[PDB]
Structure formats: structure tokens, C-alpha cells
Write a protein that binds this ligand. Sequence first.
Ligand SMILES: Nc1ncnc2c1ncn2[C@@H]1O[C@H](COP(=O)(O)OP(=O)(O)O)[C@@H](O)[C@H]1O
Ligand SMILES: Nc1ncnc2c1ncn2[C@@H]1O[C@H](COP(=O)(O)OP(=O)(O)O)[C@@H](O)[C@H]1O
Ligand SMILES: Nc1ncnc2c1ncn2[C@@H]1O[C@H](COP(=O)(O)OP(=O)(O)O)[C@@H](O)[C@H]1O
Ligand SMILES: Nc1ncnc2c1ncn2[C@@H]1O[C@H](COP(=O)(O)OP(=O)(O)O)[C@@H](O)[C@H]1O
Ligand SMILES: Nc1ncnc2c1ncn2[C@@H]1O[C@H](COP(=O)(O)OP(=O)(O)O)[C@@H](O)[C@H]1O
Ligand SMILES: [Mg+2]
Ligand SMILES: [Mg+2]
Ligand SMILES: [Mg+2]
Ligand SMILES: [Mg+2]
Ligand SMILES: [Mg+2]
Lengths: 370, 370, 370, 370, 370
Amino acid sequence: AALVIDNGSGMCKAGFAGDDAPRAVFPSIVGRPRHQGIMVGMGQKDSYVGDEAQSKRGILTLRYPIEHGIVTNWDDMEKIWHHTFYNELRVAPEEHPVLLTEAPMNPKSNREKMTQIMFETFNVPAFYVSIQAVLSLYSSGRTTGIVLDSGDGVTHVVPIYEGFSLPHAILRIDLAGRDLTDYLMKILSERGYSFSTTAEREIVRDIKEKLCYVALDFEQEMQTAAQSSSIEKSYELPDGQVITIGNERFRAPEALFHPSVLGLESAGIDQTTYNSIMKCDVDVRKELYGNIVMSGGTTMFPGIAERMQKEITALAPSSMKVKIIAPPERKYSVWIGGSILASLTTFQQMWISKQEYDESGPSIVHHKCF
Amino acid sequence: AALVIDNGSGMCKAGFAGDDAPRAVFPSIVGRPRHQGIMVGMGQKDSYVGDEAQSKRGILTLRYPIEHGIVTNWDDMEKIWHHTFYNELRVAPEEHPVLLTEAPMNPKSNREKMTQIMFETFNVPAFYVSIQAVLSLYSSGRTTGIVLDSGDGVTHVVPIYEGFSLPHAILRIDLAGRDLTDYLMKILSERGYSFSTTAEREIVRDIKEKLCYVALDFEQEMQTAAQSSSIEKSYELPDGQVITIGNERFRAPEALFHPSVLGLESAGIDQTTYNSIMKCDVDVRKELYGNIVMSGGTTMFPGIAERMQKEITALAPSSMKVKIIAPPERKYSVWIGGSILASLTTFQQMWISKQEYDESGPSIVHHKCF
Amino acid sequence: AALVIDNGSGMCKAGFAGDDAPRAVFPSIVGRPRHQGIMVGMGQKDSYVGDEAQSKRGILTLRYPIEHGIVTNWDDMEKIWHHTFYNELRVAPEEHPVLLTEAPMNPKSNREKMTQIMFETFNVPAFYVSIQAVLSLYSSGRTTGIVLDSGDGVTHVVPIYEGFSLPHAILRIDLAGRDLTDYLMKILSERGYSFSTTAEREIVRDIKEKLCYVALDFEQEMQTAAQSSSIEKSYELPDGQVITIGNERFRAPEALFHPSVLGLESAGIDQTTYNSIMKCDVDVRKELYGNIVMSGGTTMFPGIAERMQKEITALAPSSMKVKIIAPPERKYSVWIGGSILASLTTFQQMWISKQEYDESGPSIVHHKCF
Amino acid sequence: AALVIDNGSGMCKAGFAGDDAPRAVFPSIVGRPRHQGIMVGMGQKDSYVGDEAQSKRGILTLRYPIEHGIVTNWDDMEKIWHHTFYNELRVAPEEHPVLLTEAPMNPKSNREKMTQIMFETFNVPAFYVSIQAVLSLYSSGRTTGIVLDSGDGVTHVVPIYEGFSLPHAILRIDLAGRDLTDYLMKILSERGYSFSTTAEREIVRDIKEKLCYVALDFEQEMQTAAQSSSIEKSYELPDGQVITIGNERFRAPEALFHPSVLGLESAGIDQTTYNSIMKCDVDVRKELYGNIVMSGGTTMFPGIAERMQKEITALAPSSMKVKIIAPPERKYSVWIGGSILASLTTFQQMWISKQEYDESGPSIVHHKCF
Amino acid sequence: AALVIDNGSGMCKAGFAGDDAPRAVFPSIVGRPRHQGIMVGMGQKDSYVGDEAQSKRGILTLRYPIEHGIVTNWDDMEKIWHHTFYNELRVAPEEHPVLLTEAPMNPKSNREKMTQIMFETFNVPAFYVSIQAVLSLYSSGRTTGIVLDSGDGVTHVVPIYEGFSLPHAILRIDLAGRDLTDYLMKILSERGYSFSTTAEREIVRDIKEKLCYVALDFEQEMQTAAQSSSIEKSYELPDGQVITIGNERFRAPEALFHPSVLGLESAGIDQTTYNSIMKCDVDVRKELYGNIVMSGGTTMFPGIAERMQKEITALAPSSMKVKIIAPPERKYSVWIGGSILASLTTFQQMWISKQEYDESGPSIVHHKCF
Ligand SMILES: Nc1ncnc2c1ncn2[C@@H]1O[C@H](COP(=O)(O)OP(=O)(O)O)[C@@H](O)[C@H]1O
Ligand SMILES: Nc1ncnc2c1ncn2[C@@H]1O[C@H](COP(=O)(O)OP(=O)(O)O)[C@@H](O)[C@H]1O
Ligand SMILES: Nc1ncnc2c1ncn2[C@@H]1O[C@H](COP(=O)(O)OP(=O)(O)O)[C@@H](O)[C@H]1O
Ligand SMILES: Nc1ncnc2c1ncn2[C@@H]1O[C@H](COP(=O)(O)OP(=O)(O)O)[C@@H](O)[C@H]1O
Ligand SMILES: Nc1ncnc2c1ncn2[C@@H]1O[C@H](COP(=O)(O)OP(=O)(O)O)[C@@H](O)[C@H]1O
Ligand SMILES: [Mg+2]
Ligand SMILES: [Mg+2]
Ligand SMILES: [Mg+2]
Ligand SMILES: [Mg+2]
Ligand SMILES: [Mg+2]
């Protein structure tokens, strides 16, 4: 048996290898109370974590300890993994090897410290790290294809061909679900709803996750939303006030396709996907315009696959096939991929041993892990 | 064992912790005789106190030493506490720790001097102070909720969530039972009954406490009382004259809901409750429109909970639940709360020691007490 | 000629373009009488406005019609502008184009309705709106710099570089002079002075505006004010009672730097200034840690510029220059900026014409105005 | 039975003697993967070979192990023959004698090592080597004639008369299909198509093999291609981009006739054919200007036989017959010749025995083989 | 008089013939503003160019219009030449003949369009184009030698002997200063510094240009940098943050010698230099292993000449002299060469006349120019 952990930028996911879904899924938040606890005997916790910090969030400040795939507060990341093992999953980490997951292009000391914690704090017997996107080929059941991952923290494009990683053609893009949440909060001020707080940041996250959709023609839908209320769905806040959302319902996720809206130098996930395909080779692109795998929760918007089709077919060569492979499992495809990978018998020889970590410190990972 | 004292703005309440009701309940009045004592050998007392000063009030002037939760004559407050311990409760204060109670937002030197007296005059071995409203959550058996206290002296609204005190959302309001007594005396002049004296102020207090009720539609009941005597109950004074009370029977307590009648800048206990809920957060209001706890003797009017329902449901968001939690114990809910709090074993480490008061003077309270 | 109006959250300012100061300066208050006018022949006005409502305030309720830069009662805002043109400035609005001013990030329907009134009610011939902070660069005579505005209603940080607005790096912060007034009123209860009324809210505003100052070391000055009366200045109320102000003299404006005191999620104007600089780019920050322009009446506290220096230099990179550009004109720097902008000949082509407002309704502003 | 192997400089060909075509035909390439194989369980092969290395070429580097008829990496040549016997042809080499083929004028240690491998590695029971060109007389069914072979690696002219080899009149010429591929890649840069990679070298090979043709008047067709698009056919790359090919469509194969274009000292296959005929004798040329046999894949261009006619008739004596014997089988004429030769019963006494190789080492070949 | 223009892939250089250095040197960038220009009267330019776009780069997007020696946006190239003549050099192009410069092997329509612009847009009276590398022999004062040019865009190796161009032995290689900048940015992510923007791409260019050096033993210096901080110099960004650079200080320019690091099929400038020498002839190599001229800004790394010595002496024949002729002028050696060439009186008959361009269009260049 082995444990698979998405270590998600947004939702953490964890479970046993060989399962079809993670068992623990919870937001990767640590909540700190921001007020004096006047009532004796409530035993107020000094730091809530996961969905506890959701339920109490009104009295809390919520912080993600992982920003853009970089762990920004390790002591909180420790609290999150501790909660995962003991409270949320109820498993002994000393008994089971752990497959962690990381974004690509990720600062090397992050992968180092990650294993320093996982061995010296949790005493995991054997361990591995793998790239979020790469696992999506396993959950797709494939050996070729270009993966759009788009977590809360990072969008990264990873072309793979015949199990070779084409590492020079990875594009990493900082548009991600968290930044779409923030941009929605920025434009949702246009109707005069104020949501500046982190407790309200979470509400804007729910509004995005439920009511938003990707425009299939941004200018036409801007025109029709200026002409008609047809699009103007309405949401009910945790205080029971109703709000109505105009063209913001799609102007927000359109940021994925014109990042100049966020002022970013980058380019849309469409154009950067195309550009990664252009970058990889002439030989393989025949097999990468088809078989565009797509992954992670930000790729969950309605209409996103259709927009990707339209854009890539507008960028790819004339009479080149395009196929945006978008399962319904996108939100878990990374974890499912890790579950498959850890299941494979032909992988059980690859785990980094605790004994090897005793032979050499965390730097061992840069030798053993790819 | 410990002693719990409401130190009420109106009725004092005192008793032992772990009891279900206070044992000493008496009006917080000191009476001074206002005439020459011509009869030798009666041993006329230079100052009556409590219900002694009730029974003799015709020859006395009655003064409350505590006004709007501020102790205005400490030497009389000393007489009241002395009477409590020795005459009314018959307990040694040197043997028992005392939980006093205070209104919130209360001038800091009041809490200082309160403890300076309680240690240096009464030599109490250990001591604490707590907020009147907060105790009502203990007597409600709760950890969330917004408390309307309305003593004789102060109305104060205190939202609490998960034992955090949301201190920025406390609203303190100077409409209170004493000022309703005075306003009733003002309008009861309209029938030509004169009650200007303090001895008659007490009679107006009894008239209010027995015959008045909160209108559920002030304009409609004004109309029907103009149309019909149906409401016109009658009271019999301590001299046996009968009086009849017209629409004054509800026009007086309606002051709680339109303080412009008293010319106050403030706003009704309904609208200020709603406004405190608006002030606290967006997250918690879901749990504060429900679970509106209500406390203190002025909240005892018939119809007040129904009016609160009507008003808050008229102010709170559409499809937001409202529940005015109004036990029958309202008149003692503060004291019962203190009895529970002092009972808790997990509180016995919090008492301010006499030894600590010897380490630092009364200012110690602002460190130890919250 | 043209008219420039600050439309201030607190003090309104208005005057002609090309002047060095506004001619009309008055508090943006409408006062309603709260009592029966028993004396015949006084001609009592149904609503006083501006400094009339100051002089009569004892019998009035005072309401600001503009809250946090949002016009909350347009009919009163109309009364304020009407008073400005006809009573206070004595100018015909039909004859002169008007430059209004708005806070940034401000609800879009506010800017719409603002122009709907300005054309259809006042028949202004041509019109414009501009961001309060942006004008401060004109009154500084600059084309780069980050502006702290802090009116009565809104603190907003606006970085500008080479005349490009870096709109993604605007931080809007709800700490402002009005909320410092309210917090001072909250803590000034600690000495037992009660000022709950709006008529007394104005007195607390004067106390703040005269006697308060920003602490340069909050903990040290708390210590020394606990040790010594050296800081304890005294104020004389409009009734001639004297009051003394302890550490409240600086504990109140310290709210600008630890908003957790107000329970706000936000962060101090120092840390949010630094964070806006971090947000804008890597290229320009060299020119924004220097040239921190500062604006609006809340930035008028003694010691505030020194504290900003200390904090930003504690946050900015080592060996990065910091310069808090704080003229004496701060209280008018917005209006002076508008006066310059309206003066420029190279701006006279930008006014929204009445003819254009006849071609398209108030929504025209979102096209013409930036 | 016997096995016949062309050991081609470009396409390998192998099959059984007495067949009319080779059964295994595949490019003589070994492909090495050039990237990290990140996917576990694909079993990535350390070296692909033949048409496997075609299909995967995008991730590979492709190397021919035989350059200009010289085996440049014997370990790869071993892999190619191993693939031929076991994977591609599925035959046991221990059971069948093998006729290998070599270019003429070829470094003697090549023929030595070739047999050292064929006996000691593959344990072939009996063996022979013969000259590529000479076999073409057998597949032509002739005993006189001059053979232009032009493989990928070597052009060599071999006059034969009455079965005597005229060995002093062999001309060996290093213009060959591979070098025409490279030159086409050089000039195809003139339109700005870049194909520098070996994976793209293969694409240029396909472009040459499909669209190019030999000009029948190079200057006139240069003129007409400058005048008109009539010649400008278009190709579609493996990525689906279209390209158009101008005069490059014939300027490339014209290198065979003006090698000064490649900067080579040599002379065209026309002039070197004529010069070999001049070199051989006066007696036989009557039978060699007629009966110019032509062989190998580079002789497959459209128009090449017509150009040979024009050139040789311009060089050969007046009133001398010229006949360029160009079957359609040119691409296999060598192998078919070997199939006939190995078929002949009057050849079965000529095989080098394994027993003879045990009597004397590989040097035995220079005695037995001619 | 005549004007000489390097038309550099990276830094443009221009000046008068007969000077010892170019007078205008500036980066060949056009900058477009990426934000709304809110300040009236700044006259914001729609496109900055050269070192203007450096100074303002924080608000710009920077694009090179020339990629790998191919002009990719002619309208921007026009802006660059216009800036050169009028703003940066302040010369009338109608009065002076212009020597432009091009990379070799360069798409023929580029040289065409280049002259179409130079005559029809700038009305230059007479004109020429020459190969970047070839000019380096003039600035070396030589008639033999093999030139490594390595601009920002192209590395190209050009052997020349006795003034004959050996055109079949030119090797063109796409490793160049821009791609080393990009690779440094890729590995500099390993320390967690993010520089993905073009504005930050320029900063990575400065970091490379100042702190990087070519390793003389890549494995040994990797070992010693793993053992010791001795190499770990530090840079200070335009925001004043310090960074430290580990083995990246040499791992980046090592890409020139193992392009497999960039995944390129190509081979190091050492091995490709050797291979060009192998390709040219047997006669001349005696004079090309000596007299390896070296050119262009990418050849400016410390240690590069020593590494070239080590590698070429490891590849060249035993007891063959090797001499890497590396002046200090490398960064300008092309321009200086053009200055000499345009100076020569025996060149003044070679200019393409405007009259000849009127006789035949831009295709004239392919006749006149070599
Ligand atoms: N149905 C949905 N519509 C729009 N956005 C969604 C939806 N579901 C999830 N998301 C976005 O995806 C985020 C989760 O991303 P996740 O896959 O957990 O990142 P990671 O892969 O790093 O764990 C959510 O917080 C939300 O912002
Ligand atoms: N049944 C009743 N109806 C109306 N008013 C009442 C009733 N009972 C008590 N009150 C009011 O409540 C007052 C007592 O308030 P109390 O709770 O003693 O204040 P505190 O909480 O400060 O002790 C009485 O004096 C009277 O004015
Ligand atoms: N000298 C001062 N010291 C402290 N606070 C001041 C001083 N002068 C003005 N203020 C504060 O600034 C407020 C005015 O802000 P103002 O600039 O009018 O806002 P706006 O920019 O929206 O018009 C005053 O009401 C007061 O609260
Ligand atoms: N139809 C064609 N047109 C032009 N060139 C061709 C054609 N067919 C084959 N070739 C060239 O001939 C090459 C094969 O030569 P080949 O006969 O295999 O050499 P060898 O005789 O050494 O085996 C091909 O790779 C290609 O370059
Ligand atoms: N001292 C240096 N160290 C390392 N690299 C340098 C140095 N000087 C210049 N370069 C590189 O050379 C580039 C300039 O190349 P350049 O000669 O202008 O190309 P071109 O020959 O096409 O004009 C610089 O942008 C930089 O990348
Ligand atoms: Mg994930
Ligand atoms: Mg009480
Ligand atoms: Mg203002
Ligand atoms: Mg062959
Ligand atoms: Mg150059």
C-alpha cells in the first residue's frame, strides 16, 4: 500500500494508491483566530485547518501556505500534512510510503525541504515526488500528449511524447484559479459588492466555482449582455442577501485568454499551449495538436474546452487535427494519475528509501527523482 | 464556593455559585431621611438601604448610587455591598471569592475603583469582573449569539461568536428601565396624576412593571385606544386612590423603539440590534439573526419578543431566519450565567488573587480581566 | 473658465480653475431638524446644509450623504452641490464646465448617476470626472509616484509611472478620517466622556483634528504615557467643560497602522503602500519607493510622514531610497491638482459635451472618462 | 536456399535468393533517444533501428552507420544486421549462407571486418561478397555494359565486357543521394525553411524523393522558373504546414551534373561515365556507349535517363550509338542481381566455408572473393 | 563618405566609414506601451525605440524585430533604421551611401526586402550588403582564417582562404546570446528568482553580460561549486534586492558547448568549428586551425578563448597548431571591418546605384552583391 497526495495549490487531495478517487479532499488553508477568546472552557484552537477553518472562517484569517506551487510557510504546510494523516485520513505515515506531487519548474529548495520534512518530521519509510501534469497522462491512460494543468496556483503546459519529457518545451504560467478569484473580486466591485476580506475571498471563490463560464465569443457575449439580462444569474450570500452578476459572469474567466486584463506579460493558455507545441519539435506536433490533455480545477469552467478548440484551431496549421481531451475527472486527474503510478508494480523499485536518505540528505532527491 | 453579584443597575442580585437563582434580591437604593427625628428612642437610622428604604420611603429621599452602569456615589455603593454581605445574605466576604459584574464599554476607572474597594475594604480573597451580557450566553447554554441586555441603567448589544467577543460590534444604548419609568411619569401627567417625587417615582416603577406592555402595532393600538376603553386598565395607589391608564399603557415602552420620543439621538433596540449584526461581519450574521438572546429586566415587557421578531424580520435580509431567544428567566439570566461561570472548574484558575493585588494595585484588573 | 469640485468625502472643496486654493470649503453635511419648531415666524429651514448645519447642529441630526466615496443619498448630494453653486460659491453652473472628482475603484453606477444629475439637474455645459489621487501628481508637478490619498471616507493607494496608471496595483483601504473619528469616540469613552451623538461626533472630529498625533514608536509612547503626564494635553468642549486626553491622543491615529485595532482585515497604509509597490512591477519600484506622494486630510497628522519613512524603510529593500513627499498643502492637493488639470489648454478637448450626453446617456462616461 | 543482402548505403534490402524482390526493405538507420524517459513502464528501448527509428524519429537522433560505403560504426551495423535477420526478416542466419554486397574500390579492412562479424558473430555457415554494380548485369541479364550505380553513399561507374572487369576503368564518385539531400537542405534555406535537424534531414529526403526531377536544360528551366510558377509544386510537412518549392525542385539534382555546385573536384556522372569509357579500351567502347546500364536509387529521378542520353551523345563520338538502359527496377536492381547470382547452381561451389574461415581468418576473403 | 551599419541581431551599431568605432550603439528593440496613458499632456509616444525603450521598459513590452538574423517585423525594422539616421546618428540618408550587414545563409527575400526598403523608403543613393563574419577578416587585417561570429541571433562559422569564400563549408548555428539569456532565465528559476517578463528578460541579459563566464572544466567547476561558495558572486536588481548566483554563473554559457542542454540537435561552437575545418579541404586546414578569428558579442565571455583552445586542440590533429585570435574589439569587429571595407578606394566601384535599382528592382542585389 502507498499514500498519494496531490499537495494541491488549492484543494489538497490524499488517499490510498489503487483507489479511483482521493478520500480526503479539503481546502489547503490554515485559519488563525483574529480575536480575543472571552468564553472560558471552549478550548479555542490556536489554529484551525482545512474545512474546520472554512466553517469558522468568519472569526479567522485564512492563509494558503502554498503560493504558485511554492510552499511559503512550511510550519503551516506541516500542519496541513499532519491534519491529512491524523485527522482527515486517519492513517499512520510511518507505515506507508508517500507519493507527493509538485508543480514543474519549481524552486529546487522547495523539493529539498519537502523531503527533509517528509522524512525527518513524519518518518515516512519511502517516498517520491512527481510532476502534477505528468500524472495526468496516467489518469488519461496515455504515453503522448500535452497537458494543461491549471491548479489554484500555477498553470503549466507540459508536452510529453513516447514518455520523453521534452523539458525545454514546458511553459509555466501564473494565471490560476486563485488569481481569477482575485480578479473577479476586483470587477465584482463594479456592481458595488465589496468582498475585500479573505473570509469574503472564499465567497468569491464559491461564486466563481458555481456561476461563471468561459465565453465562446467574448465580444459577442459582451454585446448581448449589454443588450439583455439573459445571462444575469443571481447568487445568495452566506448572509442571505441576493446579488446579481452581469457580464462579470464571463469577463472574469476570460482573463485566462487575455492576461493583459490582469496586466500580466503572459499569454493565454491557448496561445501558450500552441507556443509550447511550436517549441517542441517538427516531428511530434502531429501527435500533440491532437491529444491535448487538460487537467486541474481551473480547467473545469463550462465552455473552456470549446474555446480551446476554437483558439488552437485558429492557431494550429490548416488541416491539422485538434482534440481537447477533457474528461469529467479533471479536478482529480492528477491524483488519479498518482494512484495509478503508485499502483504499478514496475514502480515499487523507484521509491527513495529512508535508508538512502540516511546515506545522503535531502539533496538525494535531485539524483533519485525526475 | 464563590459569591456571584449582579451589581445590578436596578435590582441588586447576589447568591452563591451553583445555585439556580440569587438568594438576595433587593432594589439598589440608599434612602436618606429628610426630616427631623423628634421621637427619642426610635434609634432612627441615618441611612436606610435596600427594601428597608422601600418600606420607609415616604419619609426618605431615594437615590440609586449606580447610574447607567457608572457608580456615581461609591460610599453608597459600599453601603449596598455591605448590606448584601452582612444583612441580606449573611455571609463573610473574607471567606469567599466574589464574581462581580459590570456593563460593557464602562469607564475604566469604575472597574479600577470597584476592585480597590473589593480588596481593601472587604478583603475578598480572590475576585473577578465580567460583562453582564456575556454571562447570558452561559445561562442560555450557548457559545454564539447576540445579547440584548437592558437593565435599569443601560441597554447594550453584544454579539458573540464561538466565544470571540467581536468587540468592535458592541452597541451601548442609554434607553433603560429607569428612563422608561421617567418617561411614563412624564406622560402620566397627561391624565393629571402627579408623581414627581422619588417616592412616587417608585410607584411609577411599580405601575410600569405591572400594567405596561409593548405595542405590536403602535399606530393601530393608538387608533383602537382612541376608539375604545378596551385597553384602559386601572391601578390602585399606596393611598388607595384608583387611577386609570389609557394609551400610556403602551406609549411608554414604545420609547424603546422610537427614542426620538425621549429626544435621544439613539435608535431602537431593534434597529441597533440589526445594526450591530450588520457591523460584525458577513460570515457570522447567518448565526446571529437566529439566536438573538435577550436579557435583563427591561426585556420583560409582554409583547417585546414579538415586536423584536417583527422589526428584525423587517430589517434582516429576505429569507434570513430570525429567532428571539427569550426565556422566562430574563430578569435573572445574568446572575444565573455568573453562577454557572463561577461554578466551572475550568474557571477557578482565573480569579485575581489578593496576593496579585498586593503585587500590583487595582490597575492589575485591566491585565487579568476580560 | 471652469469649476473644480473635490466632492470630498469629508470637506467639500470647490472653486475656479487656475486658482491656487478652493474658494468654497465646507463640511459635506446635510442637517435635518429633529424637533418641533414652536416659534412662529423664524422661517425654520427644513434642511440646513454645510456650515449652517454646523452652527445649528445642536438641534439637528447630521448626515454625510457620501460614505466611503459612495454617494448614499443622492437627494442630499444634490442639496450639497446646489448649495455649492448658488449659496457658497455664487456661480451659475449653466455657464461653466465642471470637473468633478471621484475615488478610484468606485461603484460604476455612482459615476453614472453623478453625471445624470450634473447634466439633467444642473445643465452643466460640459463635464469631466477624475480620480482624487491622480490629481495629486498635478499638484505635486509630477509624472511618476505613488499617491496615498486618505480622505474622510477612503484611503486609496495609486501608483503612477510616466503617466501610465498601473491599474492592477491600486489598493483601496477603508480606514479614513471618519473611522478614526469613530474609533477615537470609542476609546475616549475610556475616560468616561460620552460623545455618542452626531452633534458630539463633530466635537470628536475637532478634538482629533487639533490634539492628536501619530506615534513614532507606539510601544515606547504607550510606556512613557503610562509613566508620565507629559503627553496629557487638554481640550475645552463647546460647553466649557475641560477634558484631558491621555494616550488616546496617539492610540487613535495608530489605527491607521494596526487596523486590527478596528478589527479590520486590512493592513496599515504603510504595509499596503509597500504591497502596492511590490505588486506593480520590478522595473519601476526604483522610482516609487522614492516619490511617495501623500494626499488628503487624514494624512495631515503630525508625525505621519516620519512614521511612513520608518515603516517603508523597514519594508522596502535594503539600500533602497525612500522619500515621503508631504507638502503642507495636503488637505487641498487634490483640488489644486484639479485646478491645474482644468487649466491646461491641452485638456479643453476632453470635456464631455452636453451634446454628447444628448447623443448617449450617462453610460457615455465610461467611454469618454478615464 | 541463401540470403541476399544489399547492405545498402541508404535503404537496406534483404531476402531469399530466387525471389524477384527483397522482402525486408528499411532505412539503414539506428536511432538513439536523446531525452530522459520520465514515464515508468514504457520499457523505452535504448536504441531503435530501421523503420522503428523512423516512426519515433522526433525524439531520436538518427545516424547512418554506413557512410560512402564505409561502415563507420560496426556496433550499429551489427544492430542493423541483427534486426534484419531476427526482427525484420525472421530467419535463422546459422541455417543459411549469406551473400553480402559491397561498393567497389572500398577500404580492404571493411571487407575483412565484414566477414569477421558475419562468421564470428552470426555464425553464418557460408558466405560471399560481391560488387553492387556487378550484380546489376545479372538483373539486366547481360554480360557486357557499363553500370552507373548511385546509392545514397557512393556513385561508382563500372565497365564490364564479356565478364571481364576492366578494373583499371572503375570511376568512384562521392555524389550520392545523401549528399543531394544535404544540398537540397542547403538551398531550401533560400526560401527560409529550416531543416537542419536529422529528423528534418529525413523530411528533406522525402521531399527530394517525391517532388524533385532532373532538368533537361538547366539554363532554360532556370529561365522559365524565373518567368513562371508552372514548376512550383508544394509539399505538406509532417506538421501540416505547406511549403512551395521553386527552381530548387531541379537545382538540387542538377548537382549530379555540375558537382562544382557542391564544390567537389569531381565531375558529373555523365562526364565520368564517358571518361570511364574513354579509359577502358579502343576495342570495346563500341559495346559500352550502347548498353549503359543504370542502377541504384539516386538514378531514379525523372528525366535522368534523358539527360544522360543528351550528355553522353554530346560527349561520345559522332555516329556512335548511345542507349541508357534504365529499367523501372533500378531501386532494387542490385538485390535482384544478387538473387539471380545466388540462385545459379554454377555458383554454389564459390561460397566461403565456415571451415575455410577456421583454416584462415578474415584475410581469407581477399583470396576467395572477387 | 559612407555609413556602415551592423544591423545587429542584438545591439545595432552604426557610424561613418573610416571611424575606429561606431558612433550610435543601442539595443535593437522597439518598445510598445502596454497600459492606458491617463495623464494628459505627457505626449506619450506610441512606440519607443532603442535606449528610450530601455529607460521606460517597465511600462513597455520589448520586442526585437530581428530574430536569428531574420527581420521578423519590417515596420519595426524601419523604425529602428529611422531612429538610427535621424535621432541617434543625426545624418541625412539621402546624402550618403549605406553599407548594411547580414548574416550568411540568410533567407534570400530578407536581403531583397532589405534593399527595397533602403532605396524606396530611405532613398539611399548607393548601397551594399556584406556578410557579418567576412568583415571580421578586414578588422583582423587578414585574408585567411575561419570566423566564429556569435551575435545575439546567430552563431555562424565562415572559413575564408586567400579571399575565396569556401561557401560549402559555412556552418550556421542557432545558439546565440539571446538563447543563452533565455536558458539562464530557465535555470535561474532554480534559485526561485522569477524573471519571466521581457522587462526581466533584459535584466537577465545584464546579469549574463556582467557575471557569467565560460567554465574551463565543466565537471570540475560543478564539483568545486558544489563544494564551495568561492564562485557565488551576487547581483543587485533594479529594485535593489540582492541575488546570489551559484553554478548557474557558468552552467548557462556552457550551453554553447553542449547544446543538448537546450535540447538542440546542434553541436558546440568548438565541434562545429572543427567540423567546418574538416569540411573545407585537405590543403588549407594547415592555415585554418591557426588563425581562428572570433567575433561578435557572445564571444565576449571570459574564458571562452581558453576553452576554444582546449577543445579544438583536443579535436584537431596531433601536432597541429591552434590559435584562437581573440582581440578585445570582438563586440565591434564586424562594424570595424565594414568601416575598413567602405573606406577602401578599391571598393567605391562596387556600390549598387539607385540608378541600377531603377533599372531593375530589389532582385538586382542577388546579381551585384556577394
Ligand atoms: N466547477 C468549477 N468551475 C470553475 N472553477 C472551478 C470549478 N471547480 C474548481 N474550480 C477552481 O479550481 C480550484 C481548485 O484547483 P485544484 O485542482 O485544487 O488545484 P491543484 O491542482 O493545485 O490542487 C477551485 O478552488 C476553483 O478555483
Ligand atoms: N414584568 C416586568 N414588566 C416590565 N418591566 C419590568 C418587569 N420586571 C422588571 N422590569 C424592569 O426591569 C427593572 C430591573 O432591571 P434589572 O434586570 O434589575 O437591571 P440590572 O440587569 O442592571 O440589574 C425593573 O426595575 C423594571 O423597571
Ligand atoms: N490637522 C489635522 N490633523 C488631523 N486630522 C485632520 C487634520 N486636518 C484634517 N484632518 C482630517 O481630514 C478630514 C478631511 O478630509 P478631506 O481631505 O476633506 O477628505 P476628501 O479628500 O474626501 O475631501 C478632516 O475632517 C479630519 O478628519
Ligand atoms: N523516386 C525517387 N526520386 C528521387 N530519388 C530517389 C527516389 N527513390 C529513391 N531515391 C533516392 O535513393 C535513395 C536510396 O538509395 P539506395 O539504392 O537504397 O542506395 P544503396 O544502393 O546503397 O542501397 C533514397 O534514399 C533517395 O535518396
Ligand atoms: N562582456 C560580455 N559577457 C557576456 N556576454 C556579452 C558581453 N558583451 C556582450 N555580450 C552578449 O553579446 C550580445 C550582443 O551581441 P551583438 O554582437 O550585438 O550581436 P550582433 O553581432 O548581431 O550585433 C549582448 O546582448 C550579450 O548577450
Ligand atoms: Mg492539484
Ligand atoms: Mg443586572
Ligand atoms: Mg477630497
Ligand atoms: Mg544498394
Ligand atoms: Mg553584429
